Amino acid sequence: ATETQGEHTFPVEVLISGEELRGYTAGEALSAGEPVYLSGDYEVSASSADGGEFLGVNLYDVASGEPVALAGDDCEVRVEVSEQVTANDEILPDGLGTFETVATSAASAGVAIVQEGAASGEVCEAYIFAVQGTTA
Amino acid sequence: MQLRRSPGMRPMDRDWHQERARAREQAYSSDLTSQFSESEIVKYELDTAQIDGSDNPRTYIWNRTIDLFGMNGTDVRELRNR
Amino acid sequence: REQLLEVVMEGRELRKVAREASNVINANTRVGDVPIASDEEFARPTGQGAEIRDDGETYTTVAWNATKLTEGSRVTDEMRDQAMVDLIERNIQRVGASLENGINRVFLTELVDNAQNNHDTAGSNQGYQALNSAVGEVDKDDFRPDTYVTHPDYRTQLFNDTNLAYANRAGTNEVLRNREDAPIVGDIAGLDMHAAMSSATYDDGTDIGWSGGSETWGFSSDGDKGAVVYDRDNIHTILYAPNGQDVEIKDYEDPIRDITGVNGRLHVDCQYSQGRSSATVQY
Amino acid sequence: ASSTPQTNVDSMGGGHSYQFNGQDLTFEDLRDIKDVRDSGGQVAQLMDYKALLNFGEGCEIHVEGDDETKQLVDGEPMTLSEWLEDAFPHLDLLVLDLGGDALWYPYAVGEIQETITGEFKEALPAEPWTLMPESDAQGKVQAWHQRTKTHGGYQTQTLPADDLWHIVINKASARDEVGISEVLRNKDEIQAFKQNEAAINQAIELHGFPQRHVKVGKEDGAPVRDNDLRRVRTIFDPRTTDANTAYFTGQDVDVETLEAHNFDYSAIHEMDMRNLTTALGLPLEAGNVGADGLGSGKPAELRFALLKLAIKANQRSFSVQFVERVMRPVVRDYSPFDHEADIRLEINDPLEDIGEVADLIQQVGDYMTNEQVAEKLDLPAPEDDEVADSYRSPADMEKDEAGV
Amino acid sequence: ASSTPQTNVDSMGGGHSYQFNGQDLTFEDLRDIKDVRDSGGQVAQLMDYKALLNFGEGCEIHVEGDDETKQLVDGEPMTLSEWLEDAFPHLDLLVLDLGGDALWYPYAVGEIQETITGEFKEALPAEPWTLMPESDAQGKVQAWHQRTKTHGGYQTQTLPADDLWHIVINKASARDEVGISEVLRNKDEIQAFKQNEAAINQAIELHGFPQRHVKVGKEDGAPVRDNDLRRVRTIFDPRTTDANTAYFTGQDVDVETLEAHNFDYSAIHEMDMRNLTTALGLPLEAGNVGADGLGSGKPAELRFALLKLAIKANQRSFSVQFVERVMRPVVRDYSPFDHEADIRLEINDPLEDIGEVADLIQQVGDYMTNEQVAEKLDLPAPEDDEVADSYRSPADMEKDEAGV
Ligand SMILES: [K+]
Ligand SMILES: [Mg+2]
Ligand SMILES: [Mg+2]
Ligand SMILES: [Mg+2]
Ligand SMILES: [Mg+2]
Ligand SMILES: [Mg+2]
Ligand SMILES: [Mg+2]
Ligand SMILES: [Mg+2]
Ligand SMILES: [Mg+2]
Ligand SMILES: [Mg+2]
After folding, report:
1. Contact C3 E188 (CB under 8 A)
2. CB–CB of D26/D134 below 8 Å?
3. CA A76, A79, A84: angle at the middle one, nearest 5?
4. Nearest CA in chain E to D271
5. Nearest to D12 among E150, E243, E402 (CB)
6. Ramachandran region of residue E13, left (φ > 0), alpha (ψ -120 to 50) or beta?
7. Which residues does D281 contact at the CB level (< 8 Å), separation at least 6?
8. What does each C-alpha distance from D338 to D66, D69, D76, E120 come to in angstroms?
9. A133 vs A47: CA distance, rounded Å
10. Residue E360 and residue E348: Cα distance in Å, rounded?
11. Which end of chain C, C or N, has fewer beta carbons within 10 A?
12. Strand ranges in E116-210 using DSSP code E only, listed in sequence order
């Protein structure tokens, strides 16, 4: 995700605030700001489209098998949303490397709450507050 | 917070420069996937480097199978008319 | 022998003027009050031997609540070692700059929004005559301005005015030669200071963590406020800092995680003592 | 020319914060220097040896035309030199204290203290890690900012540059009125030294000594559990063992050894001490470490010349500032003499050899006045002016006078 | 001939700060020198030793026939040496600062400064990394351009060549007024040194110490997983192991060692220090490194002669420029004396043995005047001109006069 400044495109700094960073192994190639979930023992992969797959956001671009830094819950992050969002909206991994609202998803509870609204395809600021896994 | 691998920080890293310089000097084609690790292409953003093999010295060096004149190992961009 | 190109090219830098262009108070407390006296009145026609009625001084205050402005940065310790430049010095410079820009936003947004007078140019006579008219608007409230704060489009338009651009009309060719660095630009319509502002400075409310002002800052379209003509002694910028007089920048290591950071802070408010001492110029 | 400096000085506004510095050093950096000095061990001892070489041999005050200064101070006559020696009775200790501080920290700093009667008492040093200067657009100090640990709260205050004094041995430039800490300048080298020393100590513990490895059970045979090994551990326990214990076993017990694995920690210690002593400008010998070839001949003469030159530079730098910023103000404000007189403070050479001076006096005394000989030999000059000023020995003048 | 140069020079058409390397001397290059200077460690200490050798031994002022210059300056006599000694009281420190700067940077540079009453105060140095000269088409400096850090940005200004002064020790040619920095000249050698130092330090961390390698499981037997090794890690944990820890195991645990993998880092250190010292023109010994055969006899005599010649060359180059561009203007503009007088500023030889001088005075004093002896011996000449000008010692003249 990107700022534009004249000719230049700058990558956004993903992590706004938060001290709880943790290291994992990439199960596949991943890019900065993607939501990820556990896919093997300490191995993280990109989150699919509804609930039950979120541990945190990947902080930097990786090849498969490289070490990954996550921002987990308790972090504030700059993340791209696939739809227009507003303050107080709960958001969820979208399956597309973006987030979307809980309201749009098939799920009933989110993983982060929007603090600063954004248009479709634009960077919101959100607080990550929960993880989601396999409940059946 | 910004890590050493984080996308907004890559241009500050001495290794990002050193390794992109290596990649240009080592390359034999613009087809990165033929030659470089998925790690290298991601970590050093090699899609954004102007890699084509034109900076590799061995693109310009003669290596004929029989050499009676000691011509092999000469680099054509070091000749008088280059 | 792979010698790197060591240099880093700078970004856009905003103009910083609030410390010069307003009365700075270095406050002892983060909240406080400036006492204001009532306006002068007229003595009363009185019969001989009648009681003299009272109409003494009355007083009020303008309160300050210095808002804490902050800017932080954190980097992995491993990267401080691999950086092409002093990466902590660069973050100190950015953090200090973000605070100076913060002061200037607080100042300019108070200055533009709470000016009690306005001169509407109605898309015409926008150069010297607008400055003279805006002084006239402040003069009708019996204050005297001495400073003007100006948008880039207002400056651009003003230096096209033949009264400034022709050497014989200005009595000097400095405006044609040196533009905003000409001595006449800081010595016009009785004003003895010019404070050139940046476009991004005013609080549009589009920036994160800021909730916007009431006006539009600009000089490009019907209704934009492009300049303010005012008394520098009647607008206060109040700075509070717990650990000194001014901006405090602190370095730190995370005690656990091999992270280093730099954090800046300053508390600032801006308040008109007398908003009648100020007039905006409008497109 | 001009009466104000017309070149600028690269320093105004403290960078991005002024009265508390942005980029320039802070109270926390000052306390970092204090922690290095406090901590003991080898680094603290080396920088104390540096202080002792520069300032530990004591001092002498000189005045040119001192005799012409003769004046009654309290009915008693004094010269300016006699008065200064009474004003600064313990100057040898003060010079070592300030001279030490100005090598450690960017500056030594202090006050002039009066008696209650308003006569001069002392030049009082202040704790240099508690104080930092505020300086102007031409780099001169205008105020001093202090903070002190005071029942946990930092008592904090500001003092004018008017009544403090300060001295800088180490400067970034001739216009630098704030100076450089040699500790902060070499912060990385000090840490590299400490880390390597810790690494060597841990390596000696793990690898410097053999360790007994008892292997139990036959290869490919019956396995042995933890409780089975605990009974064997009791038999071979080093706590209980003695130098001539013998062992009896079946064929399926082996007493192997982790040998002490050879590594040249002595060479690592030499290398660490070389890096540190060179970084602090000392010779390697100051670190209790020797070197081949360097201990003899012209190679020795060079390094001890480099050390003596470094000492002379520090001594001159200190002496000038102490005279100009401590002594002259005291003469001006509390003394009946002319403060514009040519006062000098010499600080002694720590490596001077009296035997070398005695050889010199034997060889060339015929060309030296008795005052010059007395000064070289570190003695009072003769009490009689013609005896002091003449070139024959005083003992030779005495036997002439006895002949007459 | 002619009154102006008619051979051209390699200048870039004038206006530029054109220097040796066929390009323009930028403020970035100037601050790169400042970074090598301020950053401490071994390179900084070596170029400090170079400054101390060239300029640390202090200075002496001579004027030829100065006894003829006797003039009332302020109702009282001086000679030009006496006036200059009052004009420049702390010249030893100034010479060390400027001489240091002129070895580090392409030039030392500064101002003349006046008192408020308009008489001479001092020659005031300026920070050389802040100032950049502009040459014309014949190479001569016409202006000084300055930029300086100030409150988060930079000030910038231009000053005329007409009222600064500058001194160049190292030149591209005898016509070069911009000079060459030895730090920029040897930038690659300095970086090669720093990189090899870092490489050795890292290699010592990885390879200088043995490391324990515990292997678990039988070869071709049952596999052991990470979660199983995690428990074995607890048992042989190097953090909590001690010198005399013993181990008990089954047959299917092997306690191997990564040996300290021997490499001659001492020789790599010597080779790096050899490269750096020779590049900076210091002898090898200045680096706390020695070599066989070179420590004694004619091999030693030669390298010490080469060092002393290099010092004398720098000293004369500095002295001439300081007299011609600082002292003569100060005499001309603020003194009652003639500026065309034969002034010399001489800088002391750092490597004199006064014992060898005393041997010389013993052996051949019979051929020297008492003044010449006093000059060699570094003492004031005798107060009475007839004894100063005579050949036999003042003690011999005294003992014979006492014999009358
Ligand atoms: K959906
Ligand atoms: Mg938090
Ligand atoms: Mg209140
Ligand atoms: Mg009444
Ligand atoms: Mg009333
Ligand atoms: Mg009104
Ligand atoms: Mg101009
Ligand atoms: Mg005016
Ligand atoms: Mg079995
Ligand atoms: Mg099996």
Report:
1. yes
2. no
3. 115
4. E266
5. E150
6. left
7. D50, D310, E45, E48
8. 11, 8, 18, 22
9. 11
10. 18
11. N
12. 120-125, 131-135, 141-150, 153-160, 164-167
CA geometry: angle at B29 spanning B27 and B31, to 5°?
110
Resolution in Å, one decimal, please.
2.7
C11–A21: do the CB atoms touch at under 8 Å? no
Residue in E closest to C14 by C-alpha: E153
- From the list A46, E188, A60, the residue with the least C-alpha distance to C78 is A60
How far is the C-alpha of B39 from the C-alpha of D163, rounded, in Å?
64
A116 vs C contacts (CB less than 8 Å): 208
Structure determination technique employed? cryo-EM
Distance of CA E384 to the CA centre of its chain: 40
Nearest CA-CA distance, residue B12 and chain C, Å: 5
Query: Relative to the alpha carbon of C276, which ligand is closest?
Result: 6
- For A12, which residue in chain B has the nearest alpha carbon? B8
Nearest Cα residue to D369 out of E380, E375, E392:
E380
* Angle at the Cα of D276 from the Cα atoms of D275 and D278, rounded to 5 degrees: 70
Pick from A5, A21, A125: CB nearest C208:
A125
Q: Give E253 Cα–ligand 10 centroid separation in angstroms.
A: 17
Radius of gyration (C-alpha) of chain A in whole angstroms: 14
Q: Could you identify the residue written with the tokens 């400056």?
A: C155
First to last CA, chain A: 33
Collect residues with CB below 5 Å from ion ligand 4: C 51
Single-letter amino acid, residue D231: R
- Closest CB to B17: pick one of C4, C73, C259: C4
> Both tokens of residue D357?
């001076």
Neighbours of chain B (3+ CB pairs under 8 A): A, C
Which chain B residues touch A63 with a CB distance below 8 Å?
37-39, 41-43
- DSSP secondary structure letter of residue D68: G
The residue to which tokens 């024959």 are assigned: D392
Distance CA E140, CA A64 (A): 63
Instruction: Enter the tokens of residue E335.
Output: 């003194």
Long-range own/partner contacts, residues D173-176 (CB < 8 A, 24 or more apart): D173/E125, D173/E127, D173/E128, D174/E94, D174/E97, D174/E98, D174/E124, D174/E125, D175/D5, D175/D9, D175/D139, D175/E124, D175/E125, D175/E126, D175/E127, D176/D139
Q: How many helices (H) and strands (E) does chain C have?
A: 8, 12
Token pair, residue D94, equals 């003060």
Query: What is the least distance, in Å, from the CA of A53 to any CA of chain B?
Result: 24
Chains E+B touching (3+ CB pairs under 8 Å): no
Q: Any residues with CB less than 8 A from the CB of B39 and at least 6 apart, and which?
A: A63, A66
Contact criterion met (CB below 8 Å) for C266 and C100? no
Contact, A120 vs A83, CB < 8 A?
yes
Burial of D348 from C-beta contacts in 10 A (0-12 / 13-18 / 19+): middle
